Symmetry: C3
Subunit: 281 residues, 3 copies
């Protein structure tokens, strides 16, 4: 199924008829960082399998729901179960839910992810406000926009220089300062590793040379589809490790260690994003 | 349809029966740089849709013609409507028209494109003679030659060190000097960005570190197919901007600005390539 | 055909019924480096075309056999005819033979390849023990593990930091010292060029900047599938040239020159790997 105007419209019509919520904020939460979704008020849960033209996610399994409701007095839609390109989903499958958000009325998209640290100032448990990216799949002919352009949504050749809204980064930092955890908050450039293997020790050393501050396997495809259709983005990485130190010391990362860092910072991140939603202009 | 000997032969036979031109020069023109094709003499226009085994281009739309005729006393074939890999065309679709050129008798292929400037000496409106390239799709398993080798055309493992003919670069510079616009003419290394998004500000900074002088979304696939089958190449970039300055100043590029630079330099480039064709050995 | 547990099990059952060998060592030999396979003792040759679920290799042609038998008193299985991703084989086709090795009992995989030299200390005829890699296809969304995870074989997110066993590198060096050819033996980082074009002169210069010591078109896909399912790896490159010198001098490489270096070093490499097999713990 192509992520075109007709197919996205049929999905949006179903959601409007089931939900009665017109959201203007969308959220996509990283591994182990979804507790906020469980606290949406006056909420409606819509399994992906029931939405016309949504991608099939049964081979992967696990949760796959759209959740609509209220947070801090604002109307929102959340993806509960994020789609990743290392699972084998196509460009069209990644893009369709973001384009449905657009048709539903979403103007701001808030994103979190788990990432490895490259910059020497970063350690386990830190947060990085993403200010730009290096898209290795895009340079190498696997950009999420390869294919015919869907002109109803945006232009053939997008400019990404303002993909990460500056005012939203400033608001996120302001709230950290107001609650005295600003010493955890950095800014940086995100390298997109297609995955699913963690970057090797020698790949980590290369990324340091290239000006990358963090590395992850998500986020950039959704950012590009959002920017193409005029949705503002805030993206925040939770740092699980420092991959440069691990390479120097012959120490390794694994998914169990990553999830343990997520559980340590989950409550703080939930509170932070609730206040961001509340305070959005 | 595979870009094999039998399929290319059926296309070449049709063209010979309609055209009565046996060209030894081929040309592929960049965005907004095709006025020379409109001035081919004693010309025959053959829409792609009518040529056996040519790729289907109706989803994209717009012009798609082969044009054969005479320029400066030489017999030529031009692609009017260039195929780009960011549109979703396969390796086989990109390669078949170049292999048809080979079977028709083409020995030299002349190419122009629009590109972003990386080297600090480059500004809007400059020309770059391409002397080498960095093929990010090729390193990343999206080379135009991935698949079975078509042995009738060339070897399994090509050497690209002479892909950009040195004598043709010298002739192009000589003509610029003869007509006193050599101050516009540089040489440089071309980075292939698969596209369709313009390189991000942080990608631009990375490309500077890696020794790239310009960045574009075309040209390298056709160069590789030509080199594989023994066709000499001259490739010239028209610089639309300097992406490093734009990143430092938080300024952006877009397709409207690119086309405006093309219109400013179109007449000069048309005259330059007419004389190159005339003077080819 | 997917490289899943059921499909690999049907292949392994056929091999066990034809062969009566339960190997614990697997070998994959590089271009022109397969003489050791011709000397396996008490051997059984099984053409790929006869093995359930093995990939079809007739479009490429040439030899394609599994060979089981004894070397130095050890039970081994060899791939005679290696699959390369530049030929167009999918992730699943590359992975299935390695996963069959796992089910047959293989615990150690020995690999050779032909490669270009990047490090200035490397010259034609040298050997490089591979200690790490830079996987350009993997960073760019063409990792061999893209797709659903086959949980029976390994984890969704593998760690590659110990992919190249340290003790096996030390044993290989010890044997070189015992037979006085240690002056040929280096260690280094392997860059995976998807291919099939040799790295261009400007790509070679980029690879030097990024910390690469050698460049090749094979090996990394098999290493990743082996590491995912717990098989130890030793990988050795035979250096055909120095690509940085060739770029500075405007000199070229080709497949004929590569095979001539392989023939010069074939006998020594055969003896080295026979002793490694004999001495494995
Ligand atoms: O490509 C990625 N490297 C890392 C390291 C830590 C955590 C998450 C990710 S995702
Ligand atoms: O990848 C590309 N960057 C640029 C900038 C300007 C113009 C054209 C192109 S194509
Ligand atoms: O990507 C590759 N470059 C080279 C050079 C020499 C030999 C073999 C290979 S494979």
């Amino acid at each position: 199924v192509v992520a075109n105007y007709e197919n996205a419209s049929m999905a949006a019509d179903y959601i409007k008829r089931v939900s009665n919520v017109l959201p203007d904020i969308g959220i996509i939460c990283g591994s182990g960082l979804g507790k906020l979704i469980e606290e949406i008020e006056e909420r409606k849960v819509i399994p992906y399998i029931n939405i016309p033209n949504f991608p099939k996610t049964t081979v992967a399994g696990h949760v796959g729901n759209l959740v609509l409701g209220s947070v801090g007095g604002r109307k929102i839609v959340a993806m509960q179960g994020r789609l990743h390109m290392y699972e084998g989903y196509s460009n069209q499958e990644i893009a369709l839910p973001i384009r449905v958000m657009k048709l539903l009325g979403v103007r701001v998209l808030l994103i979190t992810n788990l990432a490895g640290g490259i910059n020497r100032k970063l350690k386990s448990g830190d947060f990085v406000l993403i200010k730009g990216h290096i898209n290795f799949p895009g340079l190498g002919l696997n950009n999420v926009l390869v294919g015919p352009n869907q002109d109803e949504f945006g232009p053939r050749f997008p400019d990404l220089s303002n993909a990460y809204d500056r005012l939203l980064q400033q608001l996120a930092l302001k709230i950290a300062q107001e609650n005295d955890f600003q010493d955890l908050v950095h800014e940086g450039v995100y390298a997109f590793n297609g995955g699913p293997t963690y970057e090797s020790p020698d790949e980590s050393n290369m990324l340091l040379k290239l000006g990358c501050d963090v590395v992850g396997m998500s986020t950039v495809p959704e950012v590009i589809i959002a920017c193409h259709c005029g949705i503002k983005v805030l993206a925040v990485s939770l740092i699980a490790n420092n991959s440069i130190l691990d390479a120097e010391n012959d120490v390794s990362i694994n998914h169990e260690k990553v999830l343990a860092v997520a559980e340590k910072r989950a409550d703080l991140l939930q509170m932070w994003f609730k206040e961001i939603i509340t305070r959005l202009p």
